[PDB]
Amino acid sequence: WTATSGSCKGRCFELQEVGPPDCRCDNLCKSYSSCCHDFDELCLKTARGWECTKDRCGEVRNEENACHCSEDCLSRGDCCTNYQVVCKGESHWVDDDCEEIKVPECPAGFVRPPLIIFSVDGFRASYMKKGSKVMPNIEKLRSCGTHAPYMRPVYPTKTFPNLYTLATGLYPESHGIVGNSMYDPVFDASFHLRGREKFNHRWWGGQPLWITATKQGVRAGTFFWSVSIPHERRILTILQWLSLPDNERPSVYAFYSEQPDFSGHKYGPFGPEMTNPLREIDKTVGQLMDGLKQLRLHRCVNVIFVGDHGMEDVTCDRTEFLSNYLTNVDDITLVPGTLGRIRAKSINNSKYDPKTIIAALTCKKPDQHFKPYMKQHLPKRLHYANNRRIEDIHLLVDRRWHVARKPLDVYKKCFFQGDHGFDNKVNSMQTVFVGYGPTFKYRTKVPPFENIELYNVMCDLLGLKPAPNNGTHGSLNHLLRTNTFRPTMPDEVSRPNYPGIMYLQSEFDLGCTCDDKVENKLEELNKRLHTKGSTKERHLLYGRPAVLYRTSYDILYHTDFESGYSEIFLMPLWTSYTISKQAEVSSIPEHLTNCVRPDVRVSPGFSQNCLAYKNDKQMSYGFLFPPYLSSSPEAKYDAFLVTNMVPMYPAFKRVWAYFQRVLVKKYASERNGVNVISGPIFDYNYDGLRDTEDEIKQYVEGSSIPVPTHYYSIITSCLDFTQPADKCDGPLSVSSFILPHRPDNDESCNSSEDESKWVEELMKMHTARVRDIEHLTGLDFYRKTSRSYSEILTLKTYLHTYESE
């Protein structure tokens, strides 16, 4: 019940909210049917429109008008944004030359530059270049401020997941808004775009910027705008708030536009009808900037121009139908569209089997435009698994396509020409970032970054301490003129042991064999020095990784590679080696095919054993440093040490062997040497974080050898590729991956073919940031470089996407 007979007189767009049944004048009242009777009249005035005209100059105030042109309007803070231009011979902001904003130039009483987040729905990254002729205000912001060529959204590339990630710095799996439609089995409630349940507060986790601000003494304007409030009114309201007294004035504001997304759906990303929405957005920016200039705030306010996602060409005829694959189609609930999420129609149905669903949807048609996954097998870079609102079965849909349950769903709902929601690596899903103001840099381009990073920056712009989030604080320091955050490297928790030769061959009863007893004082001192770490500066280019949890491990040195060997997990946490441009691939010689050698530095009791692999009919083994890349026949023996062995399914060995035999050398040729760090990852509870030993769900049969869920590699070289990887003066270049350790290649539809036709494609799909690998291993890389720490942070958040420009 609303007692809508109270009043909005003087309370229009109240910042604080009144408890029902006192009626509301806040934005958001419209959505709840709770506005006071006089809301529209007092708060949504429209009389005479949005602009001053020559005749209105100096007029007598009329409180009915949408905005004002009377002499008193500036100190009332309610002039039309074009007031000075029309009535005082001022120029539009867009017509003024830009000038560096070296310091904030703010009116007395501002304690800090305000921040205005100007968010535009569906604003695809390429609109900045393609629409440049019709967006002169945005183009001035972009060229004069700090801009990236694009900003990476989170998956799924829908509206509320992205806007809420901007607000919190969290992956959707952690903030809880994991899609535009959701079922939460603990609440037993649903969340939809239409309607009221989405306004319930239990959907929304983490801590959004407006709460972070309020808790720390900074006042905030409201972020959500009801669809029936026109854009001009949203701007004028922000401008009114900026005129409040110092004790009441917010420091952070958001504007939101439903365009260009709304038109994008109807006409496609580049439909001729798209020019007009872009013009109108640009005009709104012009209104904000003219309004700020009138208030003398145009060299004081920091403005962020940001989209939530891009937009792709999608039509009704590009729909895959689950009814073409499944016979049981009525026993399932599909969340449909540009992604698929499948669960059982009914929890009473014990017949329903996810396994047979997956199999019925896997590689069934030659050009199949979606791929089914258990959520835990989705590429780790999507961070899309650790939430009860995400169904166990997921369909990743090809760009340009839709998935639906039955044809009747599509034509009983062709309407639309655009949609979004696909994989957040897809070029058409990329959106925009521009930062303009005293705290941002002047005329500076920065590389593309992920929207999860912005919360930290907005906290920095406001002098706030950010709530714990998924950004890497400091990785965006290069956007800022000042207010940078100067982070420190995390401290190592566990220091390594450096074992020497402590065990005799015969102490080992591991069931391992090697043809190797083939027997000089020159190269006897030689081999000892290698084992003591003589070549380490060649293979450990950026220092050893720090272990940031409590554990027991040993550093092991070798001619061709260095490793940090875990006595708890009985394998390396990491293995580091450099392959120069000149290096040679050799094969495993015949007399060494099944050779596994005891490591006399490491106790039999902290070693793997060959018998377990023989007994495990499902499990084979591979090597972290590849024998193929050994520097000499004698160094090759080191590669067969039991301490270099890891559990691998035969199907995964096809992948791994091609990466090590073919791809590493290819990358070294193309990149002028590479440094490689490889190792295992254990993420049995799919939370994106390193498992403790007691979380491991699978061991090599009859042993305590734990089975990794993934294998990673970090491949580093010189950004200036005229310098070899091991002699690099300046910035680094990196690409990484986190490959799922799977007993089959069902993910790769073309896997019956030669690895040269599918392996690299699989690796690209599972591209990763170094930071993703850090979360998953509890390791911290690049500790010893000649680069600044913020630069290394930026490097660790880099994602090689394998999309064209």
Ligand SMILES: *[C@@H]1O[C@H](CO)[C@@H](O[C@@H]2O[C@H](CO)[C@@H](O[C@@H]3O[C@H](CO[C@H]4O[C@H](CO)[C@@H](O)[C@H](O[C@H]5O[C@H](CO)[C@@H](O)[C@H](O)[C@@H]5O[C@H]5O[C@H](CO)[C@@H](O)[C@H](O)[C@@H]5O)[C@@H]4O)[C@@H](O)[C@H](O[C@H]4O[C@H](CO)[C@@H](O)[C@H](O)[C@@H]4O[C@H]4O[C@H](CO)[C@@H](O)[C@H](O)[C@@H]4O)[C@@H]3O)[C@H](O)[C@H]2NC(C)=O)[C@H](O)[C@H]1NC(C)=O
């Ligand atoms: C991205 O950044 C985020 C933010 O930093 C990282 O997420 C954090 O990770 C931590 C580790 O998983 C996690 O810490 C846990 O907190 C538990 C208390 O949680 C509540 O309080 C916090 C703080 O205010 C709050 O934010 C939480 O909100 C979550 O839950 C509600 C739903 O209930 C949601 O509305 C909200 O969106 C959010 O959900 C997300 O997180 C939870 C996990 O907490 C997931 O389940 C959801 O799917 C969703 O993703 C909570 O309200 C605390 O209870 C935990 O402590 C247990 O575990 C430790 C391990 O040290 C153990 O020692 C403790 O004793 C305790 O164990 C006991 O409970 C066990 C489990 O019930 C039980 O099995 C044992 O037997 C024990 O008795 C734990 O410390 C932190 O909450 C989240 N924060 C957020 C916001 O998600 C995230 O990891 C980053 N991602 C990556 C890839 O890096």
Ligand SMILES: Cc1cc(OCc2cc[nH]n2)c(C(C)(C)C)cc1Cl
């Ligand atoms: C910039 C911005 C805008 C925004 O909402 C705008 C909006 C959407 C529909 N109507 N109004 C949100 C929430 C949606 C979280 C409230 C966050 C952020 Cl970070």
Ligand SMILES: [Ca+2]
């Ligand atoms: Ca959107």
Ligand SMILES: [Ca+2]
């Ligand atoms: Ca885990």
Ligand SMILES: [Cl-]
């Ligand atoms: Cl969705």
Ligand code: NA
């Ligand atoms: Na085996």
Ligand code: NA
């Ligand atoms: Na296959």
Ligand SMILES: [Zn+2]
């Ligand atoms: Zn949309």
